[PDB]
Structure 1
Amino acid sequence: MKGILGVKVGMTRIFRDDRAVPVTVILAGPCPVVQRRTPEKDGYTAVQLGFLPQNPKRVNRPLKGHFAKAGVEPVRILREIRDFNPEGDTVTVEIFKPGERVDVTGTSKGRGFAGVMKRWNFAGGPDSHGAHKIHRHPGSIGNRKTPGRVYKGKKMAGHYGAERVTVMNLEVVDVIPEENLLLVKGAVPGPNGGLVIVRETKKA
């Protein structure tokens, strides 16, 4: 199971032959394998990738040891690509030939406290013809004496977005190892500068 950390840099269209294409750039960056998990003493297989250089300032932590034990430049971020297992060194955009398709996990932008209208796309009241003080309200939330309670998981206004989202099966449109870039079909969650993790898809 391939994989790699990186940042959403932004997006812009290109031209596959004569045909416009929406594309989002991800900075795959160089990822130093910081540690390996294994059934031997982890109960599962997985690779802890590092990402982005961190000056020894806040590294004052015991992280210095976790870093030295693998003898690697102290990184700023590090997540586990599960079931990935490359080779004691580093993974880069080279993992992805253009044409392959990849799932991409990021964190959605944060709507904060969002109304039922935006959160759940409820219909709410009419702008006119009566009521007036319910234009964007949810209306009824139950029945009567039976059940005599609101259902668990009722769609109601709350915090929206700012959560782990994963769009799937995006096409790797292109890859430029020179600048450590990666191009895909654009639709990747989170804000620019947002961290994200690309990986092989499921389809066959």
Structure 2
Amino acid sequence: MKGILGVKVGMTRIFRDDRAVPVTVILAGPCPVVQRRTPEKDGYTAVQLGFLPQNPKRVNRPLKGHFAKAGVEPVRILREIRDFNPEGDTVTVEIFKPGERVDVTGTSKGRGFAGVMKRWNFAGGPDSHGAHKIHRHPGSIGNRKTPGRVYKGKKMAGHYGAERVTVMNLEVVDVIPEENLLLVKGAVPGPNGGLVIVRETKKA
């Protein structure tokens, strides 16, 4: 298993064997190893990486001593990669070669309080033929006296988006290590400027 942190730059498309290829561009590297997790000290294996340099005048004392115990300049974000144990102390995009498959995690776009039609693709109501103020409504939520309650997990309106989402089996399309770029074919969760994680794919 290998992973690296990154930022979603945006989408475009390239041309590869006379074929339009939609791609998302990820500024991934470079990620300093900040702490390693061993089954000795921690009970599992992982590598806490760092990403994006931070103004020292904004890094408080508990965190300063954490980076110092690794000899790493203070960084904005710290995320771990499970069961990944690199050799060096820096993880760069050259750990991905074109033609590989990756899974990408991001924070999906925040739809806020979302109705049942937008959230759950409910059919809504009719818009004519006598419908009375129910055009975007969910209809029935239960039975009658039996069971006398609404199930847990019932699909209702409420906050939708800004949650953790992972797309799987995204083809790596190109790697531009001089700019620490990573071209992935397809869509990636969340907005441009958002944070992503780019692991090896668990599909086969």
Q: Normalising by the residue count of structure 2, what TM-score does the alignment of the two structures yield?
A: 0.98
Do residues 172 (structure 1) and 164 (structure 2) align?
Answer: no
Unaligned runs of 5+ in 1: none
1:98·1:173 contact (CA, 8 Å) conserved in 2? yes
1:8·1:24 contact (CA, 8 Å) conserved in 2? yes
SS of alignment partner, residue 65 of structure 2: helix
2:25·2:183 contact (CA, 8 Å) conserved in 1? yes
Report the Cα offset of residue 27 of structure 1.
0.2
For residues 52-95 of structure 1, give each alpha carbon's deviation from its aligned partner in whole angstroms, at most 9, with x where no partner exists: 00011121331111101010111100100110000241010000
Report the Cα offset of residue 192 of structure 1.
0.2
For residues 186 and 131 of structure 1, the distance between their equivalents in structure 2, rounded to whole angstroms, comes to 41
Do residues 191 (structure 1) and 191 (structure 2) align?
Answer: yes
For residues 60 and 199 of structure 2, the distance between their equivalents in structure 1, rounded to whole angstroms, comes to 32
For residues 140 and 33 of structure 1, the distance between their equivalents in structure 2, rounded to whole angstroms, comes to 53
Change (3 A) 1:88 1:35: farther
Match of 2:65 in 1: 65
Match of 1:18 in 2: 18
For residues 161 and 33 of structure 1, the distance between their equivalents in structure 2, rounded to whole angstroms, comes to 31
Over 3 Å off, 4+ runs: none
SS of alignment partner, residue 67 of structure 1: helix
Report the Cα offset of residue 185 of structure 1.
1.0
Larger deviation, residues 56-65 vs 100-109: 56-65
Q: How does 1:1-204 map to 2 (within 5 A)?
A: 1-204=1-204
Say what the alpha-carbon RMSD is for the aligned residues: 0.8
Report the Cα offset of residue 202 of structure 1.
1.6
For residues 21 and 128 of structure 2, the distance between their equivalents in structure 1, rounded to whole angstroms, comes to 43
For residues 143-181 of structure 1, give each alpha carbon's deviation from its aligned partner in whole angstroms, at most 9, with x where no partner exists: 010000001110000000110000000000000001000
For residues 61 and 169 of structure 2, the distance between their equivalents in structure 1, rounded to whole angstroms, comes to 38
Report the Cα offset of residue 105 of structure 1.
0.4
Unaligned runs of 5+ in 2: none
Q: Normalising by the residue count of structure 1, what TM-score does the alignment of the two structures yield?
A: 0.98
2:168·2:203 contact (CA, 8 Å) conserved in 1? no
For residues 88 and 99 of structure 2, the distance between their equivalents in structure 1, rounded to whole angstroms, comes to 27
Larger deviation, residues 106-115 vs 53-62: 53-62
1:116·1:157 contact (CA, 8 Å) conserved in 2? yes
Count how many residue pairs are aligned between Structure 1 and Structure 2: 204
For residues 44 and 53 of structure 2, the distance between their equivalents in structure 1, rounded to whole angstroms, comes to 28
Report the Cα offset of residue 203 of structure 1.
2.3
SS of alignment partner, residue 56 of structure 2: coil
1:25·1:186 contact (CA, 8 Å) conserved in 2? no
Report the Cα offset of residue 40 of structure 1.
0.3
SS of alignment partner, residue 62 of structure 1: helix
